[PDB]
Every structure is written in structure tokens, then in C-alpha cells.
Amino acid sequence: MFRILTINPGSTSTKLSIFEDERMVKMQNFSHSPDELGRFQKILDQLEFREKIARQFVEETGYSLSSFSAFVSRGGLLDPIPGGVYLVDGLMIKTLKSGKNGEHASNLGAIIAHRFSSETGVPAYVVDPVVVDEMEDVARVSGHPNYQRKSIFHALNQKTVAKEVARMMNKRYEEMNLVVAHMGGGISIAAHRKGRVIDVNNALDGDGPFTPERSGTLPLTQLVDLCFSGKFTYEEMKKRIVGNGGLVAYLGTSDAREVVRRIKQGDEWAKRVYRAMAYQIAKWIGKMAAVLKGEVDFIVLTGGLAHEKEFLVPWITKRVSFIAPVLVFPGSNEEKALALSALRVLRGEEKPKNYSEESRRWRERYDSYLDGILR
Amino acid sequence: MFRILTINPGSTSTKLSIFEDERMVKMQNFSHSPDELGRFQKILDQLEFREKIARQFVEETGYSLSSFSAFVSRGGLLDPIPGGVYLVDGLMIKTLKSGKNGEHASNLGAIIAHRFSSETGVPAYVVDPVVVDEMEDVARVSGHPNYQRKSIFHALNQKTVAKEVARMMNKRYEEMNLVVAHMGGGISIAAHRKGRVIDVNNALDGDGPFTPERSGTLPLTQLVDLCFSGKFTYEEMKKRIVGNGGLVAYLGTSDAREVVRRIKQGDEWAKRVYRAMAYQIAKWIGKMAAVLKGEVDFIVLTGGLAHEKEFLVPWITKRVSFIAPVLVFPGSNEEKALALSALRVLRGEEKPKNYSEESRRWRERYDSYLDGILR
Numbered sequence: 034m035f036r037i038l039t040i041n042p043g044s045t046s047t048k049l050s051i052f053e054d055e056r057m058v059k060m061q062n063f064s065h066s067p068d069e070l071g072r073f074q075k076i077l078d079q080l081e082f083r084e085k086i087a088r089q090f091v092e093e094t095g096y097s098l099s100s101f102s103a104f105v106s107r108g109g110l111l112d113p114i115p116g117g118v119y120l121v122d123g124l125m126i127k128t129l130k131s132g133k134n135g136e137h138a139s140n141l142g143a144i145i146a147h148r149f150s151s152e153t154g155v156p157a158y159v160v161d162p163v164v165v166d167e168m169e170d171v172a173r174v175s176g177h178p179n180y181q182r183k184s185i186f187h188a189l190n191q192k193t194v195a196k197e198v199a200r201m202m203n204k205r206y207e208e209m210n211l212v213v214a215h216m217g218g219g220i221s222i223a224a225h226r227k228g229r230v231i232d233v234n235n236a237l238d239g240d241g242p243f244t245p246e247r248s249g250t251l252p253l254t255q256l257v258d259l260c261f262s263g264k265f266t267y268e269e270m271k272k273r274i275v276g277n278g279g280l281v282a283y284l285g286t287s288d289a290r291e292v293v294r295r296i297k298q299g300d301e302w303a304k305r306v307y308r309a310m311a312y313q314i315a316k317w318i319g320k321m322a323a324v325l326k327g328e329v330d331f332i333v334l335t336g337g338l339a340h341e342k343e344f345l346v347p348w349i350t351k352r353v354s355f356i357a358p359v360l361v362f363p364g365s366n367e368e369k370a371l372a373l374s375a376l377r378v379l380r381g382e383e384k385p386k387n388y389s390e391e392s393r394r395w396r397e398r399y400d401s402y403l404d405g406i407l408r
Numbered sequence: 409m410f411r412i413l414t415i416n417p418g419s420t421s422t423k424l425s426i427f428e429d430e431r432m433v434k435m436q437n438f439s440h441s442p443d444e445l446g447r448f449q450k451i452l453d454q455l456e457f458r459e460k461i462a463r464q465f466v467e468e469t470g471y472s473l474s475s476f477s478a479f480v481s482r483g484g485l486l487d488p489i490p491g492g493v494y495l496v497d498g499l500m501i502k503t504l505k506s507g508k509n510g511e512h513a514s515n516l517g518a519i520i521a522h523r524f525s526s527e528t529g530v531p532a533y534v535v536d537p538v539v540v541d542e543m544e545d546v547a548r549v550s551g552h553p554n555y556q557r558k559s560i561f562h563a564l565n566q567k568t569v570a571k572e573v574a575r576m577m578n579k580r581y582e583e584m585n586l587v588v589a590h591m592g593g594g595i596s597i598a599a600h601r602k603g604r605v606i607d608v609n610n611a612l613d614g615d616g617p618f619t620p621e622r623s624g625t626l627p628l629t630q631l632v633d634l635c636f637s638g639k640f641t642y643e644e645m646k647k648r649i650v651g652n653g654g655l656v657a658y659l660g661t662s663d664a665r666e667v668v669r670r671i672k673q674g675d676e677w678a679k680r681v682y683r684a685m686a687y688q689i690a691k692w693i694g695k696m697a698a699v700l701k702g703e704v705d706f707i708v709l710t711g712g713l714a715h716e717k718e719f720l721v722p723w724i725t726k727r728v729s730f731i732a733p734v735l736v737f738p739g740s741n742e743e744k745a746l747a748l749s750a751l752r753v754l755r756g757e758e759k760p761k762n763y764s765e766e767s768r769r770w771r772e773r774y775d776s777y778l779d780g781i782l783r
């Protein structure tokens with residue numbers, strides 16, 4: 034019986050849970066109000082504030098941090114790496130604290146687990162960071178030398194549902210081909226070729242179909258124009274990619290249930306914009322089908338939007354069932370996903386990756402690719 | 409027997425030809441050197457220069473402009489309109505001369521035909537302008553209210569090959585479903601649903617797969633960043649979408665035959681970038697397949713790149729034949745295409761559209777769509 038602690042720091046919340054083997058024994062979401070949050074200049078300044086909530090969470094359990102077998106955290110903005118469960122080390126910490134790859138609340142998670150680790154000797158891990166990158170070189174070329182397509186998406190949910198589909202039919206994730214569509218506030222559509230995400234859109238940076246809250250890919254010219262059109266507000270213009278865009282920008286809401294209600298009342302602009310979102314998701318799924326050369330076992334719809342079975346799901350299904358049957362796996366459980374990955378490691382069913390080495394192996398391969406600087 | 413004159417003004421050249429029914433009797437390309445061309449401030453200033461070449465072309469024929477039955481020109485940057493053959497009228501001229509929709513050498517063609525028309529009484533037409541737009545509303549939504557997907561591509565070649573495929577099997581263009589891929593210096597991939605191009609990428613404005621000379625769609629964030637990174641050269645940064653991008657930017661050449669030669673010599677970066685271009689064309693064809701809900705009769709590869717049957721064509725075919733069989737229709741004949749469209753009209757096999765009315769009908773429909781300004 035292994036007792037595990039999962040750490041999941043988000044932009045506006047902090048989720049923690051305790052697992053005893055595969056059974057969850059405690060979980061609590063600690064939301065943070067804009068007020069309470071704006072009290073910090075840089076994101077790193079929240080470090081002690083959030084650690085305090087975690088120590089407190091275990092504290093009022095009667096258990097001590099040394100009674101745990103592992104501490105597991107959501108990855109963060111680490112350098113590109115293959116999927117898997119990594120041991121938190123010195124290089125990871127240095128990178129996270131220096132925000133060399135950007136600052137994000139999720140970076141605090143690994144740091145927090147590491148300290149819990151230095152005080153108890155218990156192992157700390159991070160699994161499937163948002164920077165998981167397992168794509169093929171051909172997918173990196175963008176059309177212009179000083180631009181690269183990068184793999185930045187909800188890799189944890191992707192990998193997790195893919196393995197769930199396999200396990201459901203007692204097959205191996207490694208022997209299938211899938212098109213998995215994670216449709217939440219962010220939308221990533223990935224091509225899984227034999228356990229490897231060979232191509233996917235850069236969801237986190239706003240590339241792809243538009244979402245309930247993001248605008249997704251936008252017209253090039255019209256952009257470079259409205260770019261320096263005086264309307265320049267590096268911030269304002271920058272929030273139209275991850276904050277103020279998509280359904281919320283057209284209908285004034287990012288709640289699908291609200292939008293479906295309107296469609297049932299005869300709202301035509303609402304239905305036209307919602308239908309356009311499904312239309313885009315379908316197109317991208319088509320892109321990924323072409324990536325797999327048509328060899329697709331299943332198309333999987335997952336994420337919050339997969340719950341909407343009256344319009345969205347049926348619309349997508351009609352357009353893409355010619356590629357492969359459609360399977361719906363609604364939602365996503367980050368806590369359970371992280372704890373199980375740590376259990377597999379503790380049970381010796383999976384080998385822990387070493388971020389340090391693993392990062393070098395990746396950069397070495399990427400650097401050989403990047404050697405296109407030869408004129 | 410109808411004698412027709414075709415006018416085709418390009419960025420750096422001017423092509424004219426004379427058809428007597430379906431037989432071509434004279435054609436000549438008048439290239440214009442950067443020197444000879446830079447002699448004009450605005451594009452409109454070339455008007456008299458190019459008209460002089462056309463009058464001269466007919467001049468040394470022994471024929472007079474009044475012996476013709478029609479004058480046909482390549483469309484230009486007119487307001488959005490459905491496909492077809494239009495009669496050149498006052499509204500078209502006003503729009504072209506004022507460059508309200510942008511300046512382009514192709515705008516001079518209609519103007520030149522109109523004058524030839526005012527002097528002889530003979531009818532002047534423009535067919536399938538680059539601004540043909542027959543897409544469905546759902547395809548217009550971009551993800552953000554002040555951005556629209558527009559249909560701007562090589563509509564003449566598109567429409568022409570589509571009808572050729574049909575005629576080849578004695579069927580009607582109006583009763584088929586096709587995915588036509590025009591792969592030249594510009595790459596447009598369009599979904600033809602029963603004679604109507606319901607969706608296609610904005611090729612002319614750099615949206616889509618990268619081409620031998622254009623970069624195509626680029627990463628959003630990385631763009632908005634490099635946008636105002638001091639490197640700002642509204643011009644320089646603007647030519648990385650239609651002039652300096654794509655294969656030419658990576659390999660230093662936009663000649664596919666040159667690139668194929670390198671691949672045969674073992675060049676690996678060359679092969680990797682070329683293969684990435686095919687890879688992208690395939691993905692977009694996948695997008696259009698999803699637009700047609702999988703109901704695709706044929707996938708058609710046309711344009712210059714369709715000539716390359718050693719690598720490009722076979723690579724695309726492998727990835728997309730699961731959608732529908734692939735047909736290769738290399739090149740494109742603009743002269744023959746324009747003259748035939750005028751012959752059909754002169755023979756009464758096709759009705760001439762009226763740009764004036766046709767433009768209103770289009771804007772009325774678009775304006776109802778654009779009424780999403782209701783909060």
C-alpha cells in the first residue's frame with residue numbers, strides 16, 4: 034500500500050489529493066481570488082503561499098510528509114521532452130525557478146514537491162508536462178526558417194485517455210493509431226501513431242481551431258495589419274489568444290450549456306458560431322487523419338465539450354466518421370491521472386525518466402534538425 | 409466563327425492571345441523588366457503602357473478591334489462575387505481604378521478591355537476573378553469577431569480543371585464533389601460541393617500550406633512577438649508571405665526540378681523540407697475532405713507542382729488516397745480558359761453575370777451574416 038500526494042497548481046486554483054494505492058482518500062480545490070492573487074508581483078512570489086496550503090492540506094490529515102511513498106506534480110514549462118514520468122532533479126528546479134521557458138503557475142508544483150522531497154527522502158515526480166514533444170521532424174517545418182511548430186498541449190489528458198481506450202479493449206496503446214481530440218477551454222487534436230504523438234497543434238500558444246475562450250489561428254495579413262494599427266496594446270492584443278476570444282468574444286459567454294440553451298430558443302447567430310466551432314474541430318481531425326495516412330483505429334472526443342451530446346458531438350461525428358468510428362470519453366481527471374502514474378512507478382510497472390539526460394537526448398536530436406542554418 | 413481577344417496582365421508580364429472559335433491563332437507573353445517597370449510610381453500608372461502593348465499586339469495582325477466578337481480579361485481585385493463570366497461595366501471600372509480593394513496589375517486588364525469596348529461596341533468580359541467567393545457562412549467564422557476567412561484564390565484554374573474532370577467522364581460539374589489542389593507558387597485547396605467552392609484557404613493572403621515561394625500560415629505567438637521586435641520593416645516583414653518564404657527561404661530556390669535534383673544527390677535537408685511541403689498539402693486536403701463529410705468523388709492535383717511525379721505527387725497520394733482516388737491534371741492554361749468562357753457566352757451556352765447587381769446580392773447576404781455586431 035503506497036500513499037501518494039498529488040500536486041496540481043493552476044492559474045487561479047490549487048488542487049491536491051491523497052491516494053492510498055488506487056483509492057483516493059482526500060482531495061480539495063483551493064481557489065485563489067484575483068485580490069488574494071494580485072498580491073504578488075511575479076508568479077514565482079506565490080511559491081511560499083501555495084506551499085503553505087499544501088503543508089496545511091497534509092497537516093490536517095494526521096499524516097506526516099515522511100509517511101508518503103511519493104509526491105507527484107503536474108509538469109510545467111520545462112524544456113521539450115518525451116512523455117513519461119520524470120524524477121524531479123536539480124536541473125528541473127533551476128529551469129522552473131528561472132522561468133527561462135516562461136512563467137506559469139504550474140511550475141510551482143514541481144518545486145513544492147521537491148522540497149517535500151528534501152525534507153523526507155521520499156521521491157518526487159512530474160508526469161507528462163505540457164511540453165511533451167514526440168513529433169516527427171517533418172511536422173516541425175513551418176514554412177519559414179525562423180519559425181517552428183512546437184508541441185505544447187494537454188499531454189497528460191491526451192496520453193491518459195489514449196491508454197484508457199486501449200485498456201478498454203485489452204490492447205496496447207503502443208499498437209494502435211488514434212486521433213484524439215481534447216476539447217476544453219483549450220483544444221488540441223493529436224495524431225497518436227503507435228504510442229507516439231507524432232503531430233498536434235500548439236494549443237497553448239493559440240494555434241488551432243477556435244475554442245470557447247481562445248481565438249485559435251487567425252488570418253495572417255489581417256493580423257500583421259491590425260498588429261501595428263495603433264490599436265497596439267501588447268497586453269490587450271495578447272489576451273485575444275488565450276483569454277478574450279472564441280465563443281466568449283462572439284456570444285459573451287464561454288459556457289456551452291448556456292450556448293445550447295440559446296440555440297434551443299431559436300438564437301441563430303449562436304447556433305451559427307457554435308456550429309462553426311464543431312466545423313473547425315472536424316477539419317483539424319481531418320488534418321490528423323491525413324497524418325496517419327488514413328490508418329486510424331478510433332477518433333476520440335474528450336474534454337468538457339465532449340459532454341455536449343445534443344449538437345457538438347453529433348455534428349463532429351457526421352463529418353468525420355468516414356475516417357474511423359467515434360468514441361466519446363467526456364471530461365478528464367488530473368488528480369487520478371497523476372497518482373496512477375506514480376503508483377505504476379512505485380509498483381515497478383513503469384520506469385522513471387531522468388529529466389537531465391532525457392532533456393539532452395532531446396536537444397541533441399532537435400539541434401541536428403535545426404542544422405538547417407547551412408544557408 | 410467568333411474572334412476573341414484575351415487579356416492577361418500579371419505582376420511582371422502581360423499575356424495576350426487571339427482565338428477564332430476554339431482555335432488559338434496568336435499568343436505572346438510580354439515580360440516587363442524591373443527597370444522598365446519601376447518607371448511607374450503607382451500600379452495604375454502602367455495603364456497606358458500596357459494598353460499600348462495590347463493595341464500593338466492586334467495592330468500587327470491586320471485585324472481591327474471592331475472585327476472581334478469579344479474582349480476577355482482576367483479578373484482583378486473586385487468586391488466579392490460568385491463565379492462566372494461578367495460583363496465589364498461602370499461600377500467595375502470605378503472600383504478597379506480606385507483600388508479600393510487593393511492595387512494589382514490584374515486590375516488593368518478589365519480597364520483595357522473596356523476601352524477597346526467603348527471604341528468598337530464589342531462586349532468586354534472578365535471571368536472568375538481571384539475574389540470569387542462561394543463559401544458557406546460556417547466557413548467564414550475565424551474565431552474572433554473582427555476577422556473573417558475570405559475566399560481569394562486562383563478560382564479560374566480551380567473552376568476550369570473541375571469542369572475538365574467532369575467533362576472527362578461526361579458528368580456535370582454541378583453533380584460532383586471534389587477536392588481540388590492547385591499547387592503552384594500559390595497553393596489553394598478547395599472543397600467543391602456540387603459546383604460550388606464552399607470552402608478554401610485564402611491563398612493570396614498567405615493562409616495555408618507553405619509554397620515554393622510563400623511561407624503560408626505561421627505560428628501566432630511567435631509572430632505577434634517577432635511582429636514588433638524592432639525587426640519591424642512593414643515591407644520586409646510583409647514580403648515573407650508572398651515573396652521571400654517557403655522553399656526559397658530554406659533551400660535558396662523556388663524551382664522544384666532543382667530541389668528534386670538535390671534530393672537525388674543525397675541532400676537530406678532538401679528532402680526533409682520538400683517532404684514537409686507535401687505533408688502540409690496532404691493535411692489541408694484532409695481538412696477539405698472533412699468539409700465534404702467524406703463524400704469525395706476525386707482528389708485533383710493541378711498546377712506546376714503536379715508535374716513533379718517522382719516525389720511530391722506520390723507522397724501526397726499515399727497520404728490521401730483513403731479519401732478518394734487521386735487524379736493529376738498538371739499545369740494550367742489561362743489564355744485558353746478565358747477565351748473558352750467567352751465563346752460559351754457568345755454561343756449562348758452560358759449566361760453573362762452583371763457585376764453591378766451580382767455584387768449587391770453578395771454584399772446583402774454577407775451583411776446579414778456580419779450582423780453579429782448585436783453584442
Ligand SMILES: Nc1ncnc2c1ncn2[C@@H]1O[C@H](COP(=O)(O)OP(=O)(O)CP(=O)(O)O)[C@@H](O)[C@H]1O
Nearest residue numbers: 216217218219245287288289290336337338340341
Ligand atoms: N456538461 C457539460 N455540457 C456542455 N458543456 C460543458 C459541460 N461541462 C463542461 N462544458 C464546457 O466544456 C468546456 C471545457 O471544460 P474543461 O474542463 O475541459 O475546461 P478548462 O476550463 O479546464 C480549460 P482547458 O481545457 O484549456 O484546461 C467548458 O468551457 C464548458 O463550456
Ligand SMILES: Nc1ncnc2c1ncn2[C@@H]1O[C@H](COP(=O)(O)OP(=O)(O)CP(=O)(O)O)[C@@H](O)[C@H]1O
Nearest residue numbers: 591592593594620662663664665711712713715716
Ligand atoms: N516540370 C516541372 N517539374 C517540377 N516542378 C515544376 C515543373 N514545372 C513547374 N514546376 C514547379 O511548380 C511550381 C509552379 O508553377 P506555376 O506555373 O503553377 O506557378 P506561378 O509561378 O505561375 C505562381 P502561382 O501559382 O501563384 O500563379 C514552380 O514554382 C516550379 O518550381
Ligand code: NA
Nearest residue numbers: 249250550551
Ligand atoms: Na481561429
Ligand code: NA
Nearest residue numbers: 175176624625
Ligand atoms: Na506555413
